[PDB]
Amino acid sequence: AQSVPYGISQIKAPALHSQGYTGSNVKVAVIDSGIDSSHPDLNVRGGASFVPSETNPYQDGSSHGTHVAGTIAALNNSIGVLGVAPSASLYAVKVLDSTGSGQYSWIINGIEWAISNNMDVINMSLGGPSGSTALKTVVDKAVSSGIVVAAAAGNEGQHPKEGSTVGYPAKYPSTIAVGAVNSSNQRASFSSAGSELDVMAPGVSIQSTLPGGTYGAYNGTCMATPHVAGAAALILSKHPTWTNAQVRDRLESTATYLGNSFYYGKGLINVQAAAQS
Numbered sequence: 001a002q003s004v005p006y007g008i009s010q011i012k013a014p015a016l017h018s019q020g021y022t023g024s025n026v027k028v029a030v031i032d033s034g035i036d037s038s039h040p041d042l043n044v045r046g047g048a049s050f051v052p053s054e055t056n057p058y059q060d061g062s063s064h065g066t067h068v069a070g071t072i073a074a075l076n077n078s079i080g081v082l083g084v085a086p087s088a089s090l091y092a093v094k095v096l097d098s099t100g101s102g103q104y105s106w107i108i109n110g111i112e113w114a115i116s117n118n119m120d121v122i123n124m125s126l127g128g129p130s131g132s133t134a135l136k137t138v139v140d141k142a143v144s145s146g147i148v149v150a151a152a153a154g155n156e157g158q159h160p161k162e163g164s165t166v167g168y169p170a171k172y173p174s175t176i177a178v179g180a181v182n183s184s185n186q187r188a189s190f191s192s193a194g195s196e197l198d199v200m201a202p203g204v205s206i207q208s209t210l211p212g213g214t215y216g217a218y219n220g221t222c223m224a225t226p227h228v229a230g231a232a233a234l235i236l237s238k239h240p241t242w243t244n245a246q247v248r249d250r251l252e253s254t255a256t257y258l259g260n261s262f263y264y265g266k267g268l269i270n271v272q273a274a275a276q277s
């Protein structure tokens with residue numbers, strides 16, 4: 001039988017499902033370690049690999065991308081779990097190898113592929129502590145092209161530091177930097193913090209799909225980000241004329257305020273309020 005992970009309800013995606021909106025005809029690129037397209041609870045429409053050593057984007061040796069993809073769009077059926085936008089068109093853009101890491105050059109090619117193929121939403125549950133002009137250039141190009149780009153703020157908050165721990169490309173203003181809360185809306189101890197933080201989404205003990213047709217729970221801002229990417233798909237399936245700037249402003253401005261924005265951004269996303277008309 002099918003379960004609904006708590007994070008799906010926490011952001012109020014079921015309200016849109018009840019309205020008949022599930023992300024249909026919205027193209028979502030999962031820029032990550034591939035997606036196990038053979039998983040019975042996922043429908044991957046297409047993809048591309050830019051990892052020289054692993055040319056098949058539909059095999060996920062890390063499990064990272066598959067877990068991310070399930071939070072976005074695990075199918076509504078008799079098994080497994082349920083994504084935020086279970087009707088979204090999913091695309092596997094492999095830029096990380098089986099270790100869950102990749103080079104900025106592979107990521108850039110993935111982003112360019114997303115632009116060239118008219119993706120509506122980019123999920124980047126990845127990042128690093130060092131910037132790259134080539135990275136910022138391609139990310140901005142994507143956003144100027146109309147793409148909603150959601151990026152994990154990072155998992156470097158656990159040891160209090162002076163200054164921002166928000167990683168790249170979440171640090172860039174053009175991207176939505178997403179931090180992690182638990183089911184009580186408490187910031188996760190590991191969630192990066194900084195002035196570049198935009199919103200929070202569930203990122204603790206997130207049950208989602210894993211390669212081999214199985215399921216499991218992970219922690220990280222990498223798990224919160226697909227909640228926001230999925231929310232963007234729901235919104236766009238209801239408001240297909242909205243710009244990526246409108247979609248972002250709605251997600252941020254209608255978020256549930258949780259306190260100091262340095263740690264919480266605008267707060268927890270509320271896709272019901274974001275998409276209300």
Ligand SMILES: [Ca+2]
Nearest residue numbers: 075077079081
């Ligand atoms: Ca399912």
